[PDB]
């Protein structure tokens with residue numbers, strides 16, 4: 550009965566995921582393996598791509614131009630905000646989330662979206678770079694390394710996490726549950742109805758446990774491995790937030806999007 554009810558639960562969350570995210574891991578890995586994106590690996594190809602690739606965010610809508618490293622940061626920032634939007638619609642497509650009072654919904658999103666973003670980011674990452682512009686471009690890890698501090702520093706740790714997370718070989722059906730577990734997290738500060746969020750979280754984690762038994766029958770220790778990845782993401786986001794505070798302090802000409810400011814306001 551428990552195993553049965555949780556199967557239906559997991560399907561409803563997978564459907565919310567397919568409905569709301571712009572790219573699946575299945576799509577992204579098929580592009581990344583060739584089963585072609587324009588490669589951005591230096592200033593000239595960055596320029597050609599801004600001339601020749603279709604970006605969700607028209608380049609004129611980015612903040613005013615400053616320099617190459619900041620331009621790259623602005624595109625990272627636009628994508629981050631776009632993914633907050635998708636995560637919000639994903640969360641709202643989950644009935645037990647939509648039943649929480651709107652203020653707790655905000656609290657969960659505030660402290661959860663970056664963790665979820667960096668987990669999902671892995672889907673479009675390999676050891677050599679990552680997909681951009683809805684898969685029509687590929688930016689190399691080496692080029693991102695070449696940007697000036699503090700912008701190269703805030704990027705490289707995400708690759709390190711991603712290459713390790715991708716070795717677990719989750720598919721989209723696993724990720725939908727994993728992400729749901731990250732957002733529906735009863736530990737976040739200032740939650741109003743904690744026992745309710747704890748109850749939902751535990752349901753998701755039991756559903757995820759059974760899902761991996763069925764979907765990855767020969768993978769050992771995969772559930773506890775993923776719990777530890779949830780702990781790892783928390784530390785990745787702590788470090789991210791600290792790097793953002795230094796960018797705010799030392800790079801005063803760099804615009805920071807007000808929604809992300811609201812997230813960092815008191816972490």
Ligand SMILES: O=C(O)CCCCCOc1ccccc1CN(C(=O)c1ccc(-c2ccccc2)cc1)C1CC1
Pocket residue numbers: 589595621622624625626628629632666667670679681688703704705707708793809
């Ligand atoms: O959190 C904030 O306050 C926003 C600030 C985040 C800053 C750190 O963003 C990073 C870091 C590591 C890996 C990926 C991202 C950003 N990102 C992206 O999808 C992304 C988008 C565009 C590019 C790009 C690079 C060169 C040329 C053209 C485009 C690269 C990456 C994932 C959403 C998270």
Ligand SMILES: CCCCCCCO[C@@H]1O[C@H](CO)[C@@H](O)[C@H](O)[C@H]1O
Pocket residue numbers: 650651652653655656
């Ligand atoms: C059900 C809709 C009506 C909700 C009204 C309650 C709003 O409370 C506010 O929730 C915010 C988190 O979202 C906190 O940042 C604020 O400190 C808090 O004051």
Ligand SMILES: CCCCCCCO[C@@H]1O[C@H](CO)[C@@H](O)[C@H](O)[C@H]1O
Pocket residue numbers: 633637655658659662808811812814815
């Ligand atoms: C769009 C979903 C993600 C939203 C993330 C941003 C949340 O910001 C918070 O909004 C609250 C009022 O709602 C304020 O009380 C807090 O001061 C502020 O930190």
